[PDB]
Amino acid sequence: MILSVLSSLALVSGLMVVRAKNPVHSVLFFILVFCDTSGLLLLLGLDFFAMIFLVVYIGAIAVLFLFVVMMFHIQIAEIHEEVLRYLPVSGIIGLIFWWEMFFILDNESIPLLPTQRNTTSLRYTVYAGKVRSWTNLETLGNLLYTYYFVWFLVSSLILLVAMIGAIVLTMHRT
């Protein structure tokens, strides 16, 4: 039920991202999709990722988009178009993608139907793994910098490329 609520909010917010006449409004509805995603992540028990989606996607990336799109002052005439003529092609593509892709896990991951019986007493509890609990933060930090550090450093190289490109493409020194 809660997943239904979050799914509906994300669906409507994403439709608003792709269908808002004003791009600034599209960026603000994108922030709502990211907040909804963060709620989903909190339901998964991954609090670090839920907070990092707020810090990075909303706090940094969406701010970048908002800053740029606001200073553009885009007039509706340059980007407007009637989208009624795209109902059939979008209908076909969306229906094909829907049937093939919303049920891709059904054959591999067959759902457990909820019986009218308390199957929650069949929960076996192991206290050995509960003596010292690791947070999602510590579990990630145990791996990032030692056993998979090459990928970490390559990501740093990617960021350096971003900085250099931003300067070489836009800088006009005074």
Binding site: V126, A128, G129, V131, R132, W134, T139, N142, L143
Partner: protein, 33 residues
């Protein structure tokens, strides 16, 4: 059976060297060690 070749068996030789590393242990080895 190219997967039998020794080059394609790296995990089978590497993983036992980290079987006691915190983060990938069976919880009971902490109880008896």
């Amino acid at each position: 059976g190219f997967w039998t070749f020794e080059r394609h068996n790296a995990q089978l030789r590497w993983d036992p060297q980290i079987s006691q590393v915190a983060g990938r242990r069976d919880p009971y080895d902490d109880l008896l060690e």
